[PDB]
Amino acid sequence: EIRQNEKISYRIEGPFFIIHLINPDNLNALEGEDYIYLGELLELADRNRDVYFTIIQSSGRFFSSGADFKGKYPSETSKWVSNFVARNVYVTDAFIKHSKVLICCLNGPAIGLSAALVALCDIVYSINDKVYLLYPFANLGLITEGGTTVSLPLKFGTNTTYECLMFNKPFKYDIMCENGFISKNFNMPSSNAEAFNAKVLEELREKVKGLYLPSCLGMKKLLKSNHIDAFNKANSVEVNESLKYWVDGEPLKRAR
Amino acid sequence: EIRQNEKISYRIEGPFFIIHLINPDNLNALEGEDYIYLGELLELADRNRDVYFTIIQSSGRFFSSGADFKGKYPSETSKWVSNFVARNVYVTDAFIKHSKVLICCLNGPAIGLSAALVALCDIVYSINDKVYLLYPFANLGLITEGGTTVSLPLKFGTNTTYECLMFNKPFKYDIMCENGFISKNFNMPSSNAEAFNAKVLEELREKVKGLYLPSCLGMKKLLKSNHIDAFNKANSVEVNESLKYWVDGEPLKRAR
Amino acid sequence: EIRQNEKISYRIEGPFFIIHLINPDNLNALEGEDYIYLGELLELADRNRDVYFTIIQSSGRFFSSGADFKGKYPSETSKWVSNFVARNVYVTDAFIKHSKVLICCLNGPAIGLSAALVALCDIVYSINDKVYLLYPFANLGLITEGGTTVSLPLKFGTNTTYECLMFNKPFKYDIMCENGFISKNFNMPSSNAEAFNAKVLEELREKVKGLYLPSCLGMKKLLKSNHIDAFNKANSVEVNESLKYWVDGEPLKRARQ
Amino acid sequence: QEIRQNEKISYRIEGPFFIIHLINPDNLNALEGEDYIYLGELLELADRNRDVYFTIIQSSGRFFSSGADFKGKYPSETSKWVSNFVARNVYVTDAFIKHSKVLICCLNGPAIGLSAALVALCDIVYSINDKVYLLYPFANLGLITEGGTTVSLPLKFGTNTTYECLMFNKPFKYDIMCENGFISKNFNMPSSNAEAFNAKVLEELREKVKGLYLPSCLGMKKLLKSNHIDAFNKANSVEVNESLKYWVDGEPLKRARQL
Amino acid sequence: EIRQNEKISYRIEGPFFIIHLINPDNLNALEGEDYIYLGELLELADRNRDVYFTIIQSSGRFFSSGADFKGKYPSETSKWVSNFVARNVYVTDAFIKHSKVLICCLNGPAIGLSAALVALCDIVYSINDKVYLLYPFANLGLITEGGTTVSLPLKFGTNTTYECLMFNKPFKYDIMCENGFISKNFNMPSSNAEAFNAKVLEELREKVKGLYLPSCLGMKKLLKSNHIDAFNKANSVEVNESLKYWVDGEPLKRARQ
Amino acid sequence: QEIRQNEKISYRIEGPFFIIHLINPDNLNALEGEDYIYLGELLELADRNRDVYFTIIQSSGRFFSSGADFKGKYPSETSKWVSNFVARNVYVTDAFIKHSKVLICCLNGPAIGLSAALVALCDIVYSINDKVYLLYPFANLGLITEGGTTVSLPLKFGTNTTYECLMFNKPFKYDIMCENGFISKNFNMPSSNAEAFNAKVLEELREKVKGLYLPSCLGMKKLLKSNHIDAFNKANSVEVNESLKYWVDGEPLKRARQL
């Protein structure tokens, strides 16, 4: 039981807790409170003993274009602590610690904090070879977010990570496939995300047959311990280091 | 240059950036924005190339009784993320990363988050043997804050830390002295914090004569690297784990 | 629900799961299966949602004199893997990962693997100033066990640990107190462990009044993460490195004298 | 160089090479607990021999090893499994983790389960042909990660690929092995002559070591091992202890009796 | 402001500090003092607040053939501490800690300590698909240098690293590309390193347009923290462990042939 | 057991003990760069001797060692200091960090600077009497932490005490040493007979090792060392490189010429 959000729905089918970004007209751009809502959904899925997989699906041609930049305080610092710092530490933490198998259905590109979240998922399936991830921090006057400090070198390599981050270049489909970031490309048309989403769920129902599901969670629990400390450390430092960029004002100015 | 705060002042004398909690009538209890203000002062001291020591002094009989519990949101979670999570990650981070030598003049007891901050200082001087630190998390329905997860076992030992934290008992003067937590007890009366504060500064002016001050900072930089990762990791996890305690409501109920 | 063991009992009183070593006539020396039993009891306490504290108490003048050295295999290696390696790695792990507050009531000396278990507890109370911990590995032809590789330097300091371990010397009461290892000395006579055990429980019932007990567990969960990895790494290495000492035969030959 | 004999596993020394041979092709080189222990004892023996610089693990038939032999006294279920499963796994895993000689696996066919974990702990792997695969069927058996796979699989195959394969009981196939540089050379020989493959690897190795200062190999390995030695030791202890509740719950046993 | 070195030049163009190995007739082989000079140039670039990228370029058909083996002490140990240990620990540290984005323009092969420095760069661009990195330590009677203990497994994988290091085999272009080690291959002829160097700089001037350059440094500062400790630990151990190989004499005797 | 002679430092072996003796009391056992290197070579020699289980460091006179001797060709200031300071410090510090034999310091009087760092890297310290102290005067010399003090001082004395002493150039006095268990036994002998102290320590050590299985001592030390070995190796590299800018800036030199 949780409040409703017009941009994001969820349902449970058997062992699957399915989260759906449902605002395709705005490329599923997300405001601060929507990221918090996502964290609350993960925490809900995490407390449900019938759930073994948490599946994040979207809508339209984009997975998510990232933070919504369309959408009181004693200082600039106090403002940004409340608005940026808090939201980012919270949602990043919710993904880092999540105990269920986290699967992203990548129906199109993801950008920024949303793309950070994709990189925190355990398994990623792509609609087709036109998906990409973009982390435009250098263009926005920002730094790494959502644990990308750790996740990008981990999943794409350190050298590739520098090229992409330092020069604001996308991690394209080819780079994703070369690094095993995508576990399966479904090769379906971008115009039917809904069909892609349904097909992934159908294959998942097939793939879990016969498995002892608590083994999945037991294995994940050990696997997570490989990098949990690095992610926790990066979360705190990412969010605090970002502050001077917001307080300096550059990302605001750039928000044109 | 920074806004004024009636509860906390600062000044610079030579290589010393001196912060003064000046609200003795309320035992220097601090609201969220005051903790943020403290962080901003540290960040200011840290950017000043003439500053080598950041000295935190208080007033009255208490160093600080902790968070002021006398002193809109889509959910309980969103509320507490904004109010508790953000403030705590920010201020704790400001202390953890501070590059100047941090000295606390402990003019009386410190409690809770304020006492966490005392434990993050590099050097602590006590007014007299009646000072103590209390971390009442078990009584408040909360958990460790302000990096105490790491600082208390580090500076007091693991066994002593469990006895005190699990049973809501103070770290008294004797325990502080036995662990070398206090570098000097000035043995002055509790009724003149001002005299104590002045005496510490006078001794400091003497002790820095002849020293190559950049050596102090160079040494601190290496020393800090011993535990910086543990503190950063604990900061993120403390603040996120606390959330369920606030959201469950217990600390509020207890706030009687 | 678990098998009975005549050397070790347990009961639950409110939020306390109380384990009692009850073989004072043999100084509560423990065989392999007894150490395993202890691990099983911890795992039972850990699964009980009404338990917040696991309290380990003993009987007589000793907490425990350690492994009972009075008390089928293709090789010496296979034998010792089954008998020593497995038992040690299991019981040590049960202590390292335990989520309830672990309190040891130290009613007298502890030796060897039993003393290692004392050093893995979160809080230790002593009956009087004659208690000591002895880790006689250098004398037995063995090495560090039960996570002592980590726990001793952590709770006693590195230099003191080397003096004691390298020369088979006890960590005496004064050293325990100087390092805050003991949270309270009850100063009671050695002849009444029972009274000491009761007195600790009585104080604990008082001390928990008013506390939010889930906070205790929440704080412990974070505190444990400071050293959990070091303990897990040491456990694996301790048990495997011991093997060559058992297989070489020295601790056996030293046992016969 | 003295140790008991084991009809399923032989060893010999040729120059700087200590060569271990799984020789039970009729049963796909499936291994019982004591055989895994025996393997650990052989590694410890190679490790103490100052003339040995490389420890080479070779097999026979069409499989490297189908894993633990599931065809093949205790106060409790816990005591039983501590003795049988916990002890064997911690010991053999440790023997591979700490081994100081260059460990080379000659992969003559598929490996499964704990045997496949051991392949993933080797320093260098050569494949007979592109039909080899590694399968870690823990999710199907009602078990969890073993033999340091918690660390080795993400390390050598990537995290995302590891989750897909482990969570859904899918093999790490040749293509994935090649894409991740897991296999250093595919010999492209027929599956029907493991023997020829084994001999060819050794013949190339004798060529490749000519002119090398062999203590440099060990000196380098000693530094390389330190990158992950702690993570492996931590995983070993946790893997074996966490597995216990799966054995004690009984699921893997049940699943065994359903063939 | 720094001394001149006839083998290595530098200049600054906007936000780029450009270092150029300019001794193609000797395959840009470097003596101890040249490696030290390189470290000094990095430290200079690192202190210049207008610099955001430090670009290392070379000349001819090789990036660098490595340490120049053509080119007073109480002991063999004292000699090698002064000559090998000190130089290696200093230059390796200068690369590990560098705060500006470090880009290598790989105009041909690199060998040994020079190849180690390539592997410490943040981004590498290749002239064409004939480049390779060779770390011939097993052949020279040496061990890992310049942080390769960490960088090679990190950027090439553990198994590939063992094959190459244990058997003195090159990390060839295909391996580099498969691991994303090379961010762009320019596919230009080996005969014009100069054109390649110019082309990389031209693209870089384009790629930085519109970027907030302090963001680059801020991101690097966080990225570096992933492995900084492993690199610092390896540096100390690599240099000290090499010593016995030099003192034993093997690399010397191998040098004479 | 063969090495050059050094008039300032001798060594001998008595049974399982390798005993190193600083023998220059007239100059407070102050040590030049090459003497620190020599010490490292002696540790490496003791470390290779299979009959040695304990390495005992003893001195002479009223001081253990007053530290680096400041009475006692390069393309740059940087090259000079890399050769003279960096190399010497990384080498000797490393020799202590990695030493596998039980290292015992017989503290016959004060130790200062790098020599005091080396005392703090020993496993066990015995004091002649309660007038010993350790001083780390880096802040006064215009230097930073050396010889692994970055790690050893907080580890053995606590963080807060370490900041008070290092930041303000104050000694770690006997009381602080005793309170932190840094000293395992104070012999309470007069400062005028270091020799008698040295002999008494050795006599007790011969008593204390009777009946022990000495390989157990080394086996235990090997596991104990792994608690902090990484932190020490990381600190060594950073300490020596960070120091460079202090030497190159020139401050410690200036401060040297002001006696």
Per-residue tokens: E73? 């002490």
F80 touches chain E (CB under 8 A): no
Q: Can you read off the two tokens belonging to residue A119?
A: 């990189």
Chain breaks in chain D (C to N over 2.5 A) after: 72
**Separation CA B105–CA C205 (nearest Å):** 37
Contact between residue C189 and residue C128 where contact means Cβ atoms under 8 Å apart: yes
Closest CA relative to residue C215, chosen from A156, B148, E92, F120? B148
Instruction: Test B162 with C101 for CB contact under 8 angstroms.
Output: yes
Contact (Cβ atoms closer than 8 angstroms) between residue A110 and residue A143: no
Contact C31, C214 (CB under 8 A): no
d(CA A40, CA A31): 14
Do B32 and B65 meet the contact criterion of CB atoms below 8 Å apart? no
Chain D positions touching E142 (Cβ under 8 A) are: 216
Q: Are E111 and E69 in contact (CB under 8 A)?
A: no
Amino acid B10 reads Y
Nearest one of D8, D23, D45, D38 to D198, comparing CA atoms: D23
Give the chain E residue nearest F85 (alpha carbons).
E86
Query: Residue D61 and residue D191: Cα distance in Å, rounded?
Result: 8
Length of chain E: 257
- Collapsed DSSP state (helix, strand, coil) of residue A13: strand
Per-position b or e across A72-109, b if 16+ CB within 10 A of its CB: eeeeebbebbbebbbbbbbbbbbbbbbbbbbbbbbbbb
3 state DSSP class of B225: coil
Query: Alpha-carbon distance F189 to F200, whole Å?
Result: 10
CATH of F1-259, one of 3.90.226.10, 3.30.360.10, 3.40.50.1970, 3.40.50.300: 3.90.226.10
Burial of C155 per CB tally in 10 Å (0-12, 13-18, 19+)? buried
Strand partners, E53: E16, E101
Amino acid at B250: E
Give the list of residues 6+ apart from residue C206 with CB closer than 8 angstroms, or none. none
How many CB atoms within 10 Å of residue A247? Answer: 17
Instruction: Please give the helix or strand (H or E) that residue B238 lies within, else none.
Output: helix B228-248
| Residue A199 in tokens | 């097909």
B120 CB contacts (<8 Å, ≥6 apart)?
B92, B95, B96, B102, B146, B147, B151, B231
CA distance to partner chain C, nearest, from residue D247 (Å): 14
Chain D residues in contact with C90 by the CB 8 A cut-off are: 78, 82, 86, 241, 244
List the strands of the sheet with C132-134, edge to edge: C110-111, C132-134, C171-172
How are beta strands F124-127 and F185-186 bridged, if at all? parallel
What distance in Å separates the CA atoms of residue D102 and residue D124, rounded to the nearest whole number?
8
Cα–Cα distance for residue pair B98/B118, rounded to 1 Å: 13
- Whether residues E215 and A142 touch (CB distance < 8 A) is answered with yes
CATH number for region A1-256: 3.90.226.10
Q: Determine whether the interchain pair C235/D237 forms a contact, defined as Cβ–Cβ distance below 8 Å.
A: yes
- Tell me if D87 and C81 make a contact (CB, 8 A cut-off): yes
Secondary structure string (H, E, C) spanning A89-131: HHHHHHHHHCCCEEEEEECCCEEHHHHHHHHHCCEEEECCCCC
Active-site residue, selected from the candidate residues D7, D34, D77, D146: D146
Q: In F, which residues are within 8 Å of B183 by CB distance?
A: 160-161, 163-164
For E37, residues 6+ apart whose C-beta sits below 8 A from its C-beta are E3, E5, E8, F75
Helix B213-224 and helix F229-249: axis angle, to 10°?
A: 160
CA distance E155 to D41: 34
C-alpha–C-alpha distance, residues C212 and E174, integer Å: 61
Pair of tokens at residue C183: 């949270």
Assigned token pair, C161: 């640990």
Determine A/F contact with 3+ CB pairs under 8 A as the test. Answer: no
Binding residue positions of E for substrate: 65-69, 113
C218 near B CB under 8 A: yes
- Return the sign of the alpha-carbon dihedral for residues A138, A141, A145, A149: positive
Return d(Cα A77, Cα A243) in angstroms, integer. Answer: 7
Residues D19, B93: Cα–Cα separation, whole Å: 55
The residues after which chain C has a C–N gap greater than 2.5 Å are: 71
User: Which chain A residues contact residue E124 at CB under 8 A?
Assistant: 159
Q: What is the resolution of this structure in A?
A: 2.1
Write out chain A residues lying below 8 Å of E55, CB-based: none
Asked if C220 reaches chain B (Cβ–Cβ under 8 Å), the answer is yes
D141 close to D247: Cβ distance less than 8 angstroms: no
Out of C39, C40, C85, closest to residue D87 by CB? C85
What angle separates helix B112-120 from helix B86-97, to the nearest 10 degrees? Answer: 20
For the domain spanning C1-257, the CATH number is 3.90.226.10
Helix, strand and coil in chain F, % to nearest 5:
50, 15, 35
- Which residue out of F89, F150, F160, F249 would a mutagenesis test of the B interface target, given it has the greatest number of B Cβ atoms within 10 Å? F160
Q: Distances in Å between the alpha carbon of A218 and those of D1, D155, D175, D239?
A: 41, 19, 27, 10
Min Cα–Cα distance to chain A from D259, Å: 13
Task: Give the start-end residues of each E strand in E139-210.
Answer: 171-172, 184-185
* In chain E, domain spans: 1-257
> Distance (Å, rounded) from C-alpha C243 to C-alpha C253?
15
Residue with tokens 């503290």: F107
With residues binned 3-state (H G I as helix, E B as strand, rest as coil), the percentages for chain B, rounded to 5, are 50, 15, 35
Count CB atoms within 10 A of the CB of residue C17: 24
Residues paired with C123 in a beta bridge: C103
Angle formed by the axes of helices D159-167 and D149-157, to 10°? 120
Q: For residue D91, list chain C residues with Cβ-Cβ distance below 8 A.
A: 77, 81, 85, 240, 243
Which amino acid type is present at position C79? Answer: K
Instruction: Please answer yes or no on whether A180 and D166 come within 8 Å at the CB atom.
Output: no
| Cα B160-B165-B169 angle, rounded to 5 deg | 80
Burial class (CB in 10 A: 0-12, 13-18, 19+), A42: buried
Q: How far apart are CA F183 and CA F133, in angstroms?
A: 11
**Subunits in contact with chain D (3 or more CB pairs closer than 8 Å):** A, C, E
Distance of residue C145 Cα from the nearest chain B Cα, in angstroms: 20
> Do B254 and B140 form a contact (C-beta atoms < 8 A)?
yes
CB environment D139-168: b (16+ within 10 A), e (fewer): bbbbbbbbbbbbbbbbbbbbbbbbbbbbbb
What residues have CB less than 8 Å from E190, skipping those under 6 apart? Answer: E61, E107, E108, E127, E128, E130
Going by their DSSP bridges, the two strands A8-13 and A16-21 should be labelled as antiparallel
Q: How far is CA D208 from the centre of its chain?
A: 24
E219 touching A (Cβ < 8 Å): yes
Longest dimension (CA), chain F: 58
Q: At what angle do helices C148-156 and F214-225 cross, to 10 degrees?
A: 70
DSSP F227-243: TTHHHHHHHHHHHHHHH
Which among B36, B74, B89 has CB closest to A239? B89
Asked if residue C41 lies in contact with residue C96, where contact means CB atoms within 8 angstroms, the answer is: no
Per-residue CA distances from A71 to A25, A84, A111, B80 (Å): 16, 12, 16, 21
- Beta carbons of E104 and D177 less than 8 angstroms apart: no
Q: Which residue of D has its CA nearest to A208?
A: D168
Handedness of CA A55, A59, A64, A69 (dihedral sign): negative
> What is the DSSP-derived secondary structure letter of residue E26?
G
**Is D181's CB within 8 Å of E157's CB?**
yes
Q: What is the Cα–Cα distance from E228 to E154, expressed in whole angstroms?
A: 12
Residue C104 near residue C123 (C-beta atoms within 8 A): yes
Residue D75 token pair: 């106060």
Tokens 């001050």: give the residue: B213
Residue type, B209: K
Q: What 3-state DSSP class applies to A147?
A: coil
Write the burial class of residue B105 (CB in 10 Å: 0-12 exposed, 13-18 middle, 19+ buried): buried
Residues ≥6 apart with Cβ < 8 Å to E225:
A149, A234, A237
Q: Is A246 helix (H, G, I), strand (E, B) or coil?
A: helix
A96: nearest Cα among A238, A221, A237, A228: A228
Partners of F201 in the β-ladder: none
The answer, for A98 touching chain B at a CB cutoff of 8 Å, is no
Query: What is the number of alpha carbons within 13 Å of residue F232 lying toward its C-beta?
Result: 25
Tell me whether residue D146 is one of the annotated catalytic residues: yes
Closest C-alpha to B147, from B50, B255, B68, B224: B224
Q: Which ranges in chain D belong to alpha helices (H)?
A: 33-48, 77-81, 87-98, 113-120, 138-141, 149-157, 159-167, 174-179, 194-209, 214-225, 229-249, 251-256
Sole residue written with tokens 């115009």: A191
Catalytic residues of C: 145
| Beta-carbon pairs below 8 A across chains C and D | 85
Per the CB < 8 Å rule, is E142 touching D216?
Answer: yes
Would you call B143 and C178 a contact, using CB atoms and an 8 Å cutoff? Answer: no
DSSP per-residue string spanning F122-181: SSEEEESSTT-EEE--HHHHT----TTHHHHHHHHH-HHHHHHHHHTT--EEHHHHHHTT
- Give me the residues paired with residue C177 across strands: none
> Which amino acid would we find at residue D12?
R
How many Cβ atoms sit within 10 Å of the Cβ of residue B50? 10
B68 labelled binding-site residue = yes
Which residue among C123, C178, C225 places its CB closest to the CB of B162?
Answer: C123
> What secondary structure letter does DSSP report for F60?
B
Q: Contact, B68 vs B30, CB < 8 A?
A: yes
Residues near D108 by Cβ (< 8 Å), separated by ≥ 6? D58, D59, D60, D61, D62, D63, D64, D128, D132, D191, D194, D197, D198
- What are the tokens at C82? 């089954």
A13 vs A146: CA distance, rounded Å: 28
A193 is in an annotated binding site: no
Rounded to whole angstroms, what are the CA distances from B33 to A236, B140, D34? Answer: 19, 21, 65
β-pairing, D17-22 with D9-14? Answer: antiparallel
DSSP state of C56: E
Distance from CA of C73 to the nearest CA of F (A): 26
Q: How many angstroms separate the Cα of B253 from the Cα of each of B136, B141, E251?
A: 15, 9, 74
- Contact call for residues D29 and D22 (beta carbons, < 8 A): yes
Is D231 annotated in a binding site? The answer is no
Q: Which of B16, B124, B219 to mutate to test the interface with F (most CBs of F within 10 A)?
A: B219
Q: Does the annotation flag F70 for ligand binding?
A: yes
Nearest C-alpha neighbor of F182 from the set F240, F111, F235: F111
> Cβ–Cβ of B90/A240 closer than 8 Å?
yes
Starting at the edge strand that comes first in sequence, how are the strands of the sheet with E184-185 ordered? E8-13, E16-21, E53-57, E101-106, E123-126, E184-185
What are the phi and psi torsion angles at C56 (to 5°)? -105, 120
Method of structure determination? X-ray
Q: Which amino acid is at E126?
A: S
Report yes or no: F56 at the C interface, CB cutoff 8 Å.
Answer: no
Task: Identify whether the C-beta of residue C53 lies closer than 8 Å to the C-beta of residue C110.
Answer: no
B113: annotated binding-site residue? yes
For residues F238-250, one letter each, b for 16 or more C-beta atoms within 10 angstroms of the residue's C-beta and e for the rest, the string is bbbbbbbbbbbee
Residues 115-174, chain E: which have Cβ within 8 Å of A?
Answer: 122-124, 154-155
Cα separation, A32 vs A21, in Å, equals 15
> Looking at beta carbons, which residues of chain C come within 8 Å of F102?
162, 166
Phi, then psi, of C227 in degrees rounded to 5: -130, 5
Q: Are strands A123-126 and A184-185 parallel, antiparallel or unpaired?
A: parallel
